[PDB]
Design a protein that fits this description.
The chain contains no helices and no strands. By secondary structure, the chain is mostly loops. Bound molecules: zinc ion (4 copies). The PDB classes it as metal binding protein.
């Protein structure tokens, strides 16, 4: 639901809620990705 980062709550990283191809850096997003290779710190 909308942004899930503690900084990208507007356009710091994505235009409000990673649409998909946001290419986040804190959550490691990529065209709607889940990331977390070896259990990352991703808390969602
Ligand atoms: Zn996000
Ligand atoms: Zn993202
Ligand atoms: Zn994300
Ligand atoms: Zn990651």
């Amino acid at each position: 639901e909308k942004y899930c980062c503690e900084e990208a709550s507007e356009k710091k990283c994505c235009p409000a809620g990673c649409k998909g191809d946001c290419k986040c850096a804190n959550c490691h997003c990529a065209e709607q990705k889940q990331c977390g290779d070896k259990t990352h710190q991703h808390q969602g």
